[PDB]
Design a binder for this molecule. Structure first.
Ligand SMILES: CC(=O)N[C@@H](C)C(=O)N1C[C@H](O)C[C@H]1C(=O)NCc1ccc(-c2scnc2C)cc1
Lengths: 104, 141, 87
């Protein structure tokens, strides 16, 4: 079963899919192909939780019914600058304006 | 041009609403005119009596947004084989993002205030040109 | 796979498949690997990128199609974006 993901780090936001049966490490390989950083320099998160390389996305809560195309699930990403890992930072999206008078 | 064939060969049908909208079945009668039928709530079905060669199409009851029936615009009852009804699956189309954005904007603003919105005059004309059954029958024809 | 970068007014960088972004004729022209949008904020452009995924998933499928959701707060800005993008 396909799961649909937003992988997020600072202002970067990848949109991709993976199988529910695929691993966290396999998703890191996908990030490697796009952002040119290998799995060892990567750290994937679900909310505040670090994920383990050998665990499937399904085991980490990404199911085909929560991680939908129209409303995909977020996966935090953090890089290693040489020595140690940076803190997980996801820049929030912009604020919408106030609902105009006519839309209330 | 688009009219039901007056065959008088009965055809039993299941209108099955696999959409989140309240569905309004529209029969195109023998002189071309759209006749409305009772509404189907979302996820409900009705076993109905129609005839072969009759023409139906399906709309959102509240906004007249177009729905599909068996992947297409129009549904025609075929011959019942095995004494068994023909299945008529009413579903959403994959609307364009633009038309979907129009639907939501239409559902939040009343017709009077479309001109007050801060958008191009091309979009007032798209907003006011709401889905309509006579419009679509002229296209198909 | 082949990816492209779509950049919002506020500097957010959305990386999506090239197939998905070519849905929009405007983006295809803007390419023919990154495309900066001066007028589309990130809260709008993420819904656009969600719509691409949605549209590629459910086009040519007899599975029940769900309603593509749009919050009331972002409907005007998304309308204006789709009208520009033609998707
Ligand atoms: C002689 C002839 O064919 N007369 C037409 C008016 C007729 O009887 N029709 C046209 C269509 O083929 C359907 C049929 C008809 O009206 N059947 C009765 C009917 C009643 C309600 C319903 C519906 S539609 C949604 N819910 C219901 C209960 C469907 C069919």
């Amino acid at each position: 079963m396909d799961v649909f993901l937003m992988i997020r780090r600072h202002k970067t936001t990848i949109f991709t899919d993976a199988k529910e049966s695929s691993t966290v490490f396999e998703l890191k390989r996908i990030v490697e192909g796009i952002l040119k950083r290998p799995p060892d320099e990567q750290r994937l998160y679900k909310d505040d939780q670090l994920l383990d390389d050998g665990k499937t996305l399904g085991e980490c809560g990404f199911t085909s019914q929560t991680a939908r195309p129209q409303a995909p699930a977020t996966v935090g990403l953090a890089f290693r600058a040489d020595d140690t890992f940076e803190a997980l930072c996801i820049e929030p999206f912009s604020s919408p304006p106030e609902l105009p008078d006519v839309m209330k | 041009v688009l009219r039901s064939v007056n065959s008088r060969e009965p055809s039993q049908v299941i209108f099955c609403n696999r959409s989140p909208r309240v569905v309004l079945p529209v029969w195109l009668n023998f002189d071309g005119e759209p006749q409305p039928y009772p509404t189907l709530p979302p996820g409900t079905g009705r076993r109905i009596h129609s005839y072969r060669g009759h023409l139906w199409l399906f709309r959102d009851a509240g906004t007249h947004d177009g729905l599909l029936v068996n992947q297409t615009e129009l549904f025609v009852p075929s011959l019942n084989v095995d004494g068994q009804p023909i299945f008529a699956n009413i579903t959403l189309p994959v609307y364009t993002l633009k038309e979907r954005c129009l639907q939501v904007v239409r559902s939040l603003v009343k017709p009077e205030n479309y001109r007050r919105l801060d958008i191009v005059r091309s979009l007032y004309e798209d907003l006011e040109d709401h889905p309509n059954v006579q419009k679509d029958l002229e296209r198909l024809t | 796979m082949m990816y492209v970068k779509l950049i919002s007014s506020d500097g957010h960088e959305f990386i999506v498949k090239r197939e998905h972004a070519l849905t929009s004729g405007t983006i295809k022209a803007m390419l023919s690997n990154e495309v900066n949008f001066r007028e589309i904020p990130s809260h709008v452009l993420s819904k656009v990128c969600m719509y691409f995924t949605y549209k590629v998933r459910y086009t040519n499928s007899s599975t029940e199609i769900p309603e593509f959701p749009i919050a009331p707060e972002i409907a005007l800005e998304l309308l204006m974006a789709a009208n520009f993008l033609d998707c």
